[PDB]
Amino acid sequence: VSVDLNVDPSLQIDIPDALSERDKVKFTVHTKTTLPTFQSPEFSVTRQHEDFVWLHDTLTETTDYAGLIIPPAPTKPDFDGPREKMQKLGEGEGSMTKEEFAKMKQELEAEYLAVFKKTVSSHEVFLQRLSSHPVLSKDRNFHVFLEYDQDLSV
Ligand SMILES: [Cl-]
């Protein structure tokens, strides 16, 4: 076989759920850790795209990391494709039967969901990459990002 094996890793991060309200995304960032450095071995916080941008910016400009490979920022969530397509669909409502339109409305909702899912992955991959870096996983701004249980913006 050919296989990548992880045994009792000390830091695991994922985004198990997320919420879109008028195309504004809130990510649940859930962490599991066996490390002393964290207040708790398991916890979740709520993060927005700008929080991730904040974290990436502040790592990039950390003098000590200038020789390190910092994983790329996740891209800003963008629902313009699905939204514009749904608008076009609505304009064409008269040319179409009730059940044709229903079926297509459902298909475009699925298109929106696939965009959502993709931006989730992008944000999650970034955190997982940071958790795997021997130096960056220890960064205190990263820790603040994972655990500060209030609005990181303010
Ligand atoms: Cl957003």
Q: Quickly list DSSP for 28-95.
A: EEEEEE--TTSS-SEEEEEE-HHHHHHHHHHHHT-GGGTTS-PPPPPPPP--HHHHHHHHHHHHTGGG
> Does 95 appear as a known binding residue?
yes
b/e 126-138 (16+ beta carbons within 10 angstroms → b): bbebbbebeebbe
Distances in Å between the Cα of 101 and the Cα atoms of 76, 92, 104, 107 are: 30, 9, 5, 10
What separation in Å is there between the alpha carbon of 53 and the centre of ligand 1?
Answer: 11
**Residue 124 annotated as binding site:** no
User: For the chain, what is the total number of helices (H) and then of strands (E)?
Assistant: 4, 4
Instruction: Write the CA distances from 150 to 30, 89, 138, integer angstroms.
Output: 15, 40, 21
We find that the CATH architecture of domain 1-154 is 2-Layer Sandwich (3.30)
Interval between CA 52 and ligand 1 midpoint (Å): 11
Q: Kindly give the distance from the C-alpha atom of residue 24 to the centroid of ligand 1, in angstroms, as a whole number.
A: 4
Q: Are strands 11-14 and 24-33 parallel, antiparallel or unpaired?
A: antiparallel
**Resolution given for this structure, in angstroms:** 2.2
Q: Could you tell me if 76 and 17 are in contact, meaning their C-beta atoms sit under 8 angstroms apart? A: no
